[PDB]
Write a protein that binds this ligand. Structure first.
Ligand SMILES: */C=C/C(=O)N1CCN(c2c(C#N)c(=O)n(-c3c(C)ccnc3C(C)C)c3nc(-c4c(N)c(F)c(F)c(F)c4F)c(Cl)cc23)CC1
Ligand SMILES: Nc1nc2c(ncn2[C@@H]2O[C@H](COP(=O)(O)OP(=O)(O)O)[C@@H](O)[C@H]2O)c(=O)[nH]1
Ligand SMILES: [Cl-]
Ligand SMILES: [Mg+2]
Length: 167
């Protein structure tokens, strides 16, 4: 049988959670996808010779989902923690996303990948060095992405599957 992986995409409003997810699922860039929509998407992929069924939850942090947030997160096997390379606040928020994931999962060994999105844009305010130092402090990988060009997007999700395997 195919190995099934429940992945959860988190991070500040506007970092590109939806754009990243829709690239993997539908192979196109969506400009300004409805920021309020939270849904799960399924995709079959081959990673290192293993057929994987991915169930990806694209979080939107809306008030209507707030009561059930912990129940939705607890079934996640791995988390993509996304910031944008032109938004320092989204990078500062990463340690808070990790605080909440560690709380819900009651563990410091939750499979996780740090993702720096929008690497196509010129006006960078967070360097790869900063993100790699943060990832190293957590013992997790860092992957740079552009949801616009699709560069690195699959590497981010596939890296998270490899982290879930180690767990
Ligand atoms: C464009 C809309 C959008 O993408 N988002 C809306 C807001 N959102 C979000 C926010 C905000 N603003 C937020 O403050 N937090 C919380 C909460 C509610 C409580 C404590 N810390 C945070 C941040 C700073 C980590 C969000 N948390 C989560 C969330 C929660 N509650 C959780 F328990 C987890 F285990 C998570 F993995 C997790 F990520 C989410 Cl879904 C969304 C926000 C961002 C998205
Ligand atoms: N140039 C560029 N724009 C992006 C990228 N990813 C997302 N966007 C845009 O950034 C905004 C926020 O993206 P969205 O996917 O809605 O973020 P979410 O709130 O995290 O789901 C939208 O206007 C997207 O079109 C990227 O890699 N490059
Ligand atoms: Cl929430
Ligand atoms: Mg979204």
């Amino acid at each position: 049988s195919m190995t099934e992986y429940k992945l959860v995409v988190v991070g500040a409003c506007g970092v590109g959670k939806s754009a990243l997810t829709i690239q993997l699922i539908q192979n196109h860039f969506v400009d300004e996808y409805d920021p309020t929509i939270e849904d799960s998407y399924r995709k079959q992929v081959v990673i290192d010779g293993e057929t994987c069924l991915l169930d990806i939850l694209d979080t939107a942090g809306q008030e209507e989902y707030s009561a059930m947030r912990d129940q939705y997160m607890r079934t996640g096997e791995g988390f993509l923690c996304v910031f944008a390379i032109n938004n320092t606040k989204s990078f500062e928020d990463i340690h808070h996303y990790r605080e909440q994931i560690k709380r819900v999962k009651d563990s410091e060994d939750v499979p996780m990948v740090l993702v720096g999105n929008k690497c196509d844009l010129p006006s960078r305010t967070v360097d790869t060095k900063q993100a790699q130092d943060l990832a190293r402090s957590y013992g997790i990988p860092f992957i740079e992405t552009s949801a616009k060009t699709r560069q690195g997007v699959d590497d981010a999700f596939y890296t998270l599957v490899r982290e879930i395997r180690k767990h």
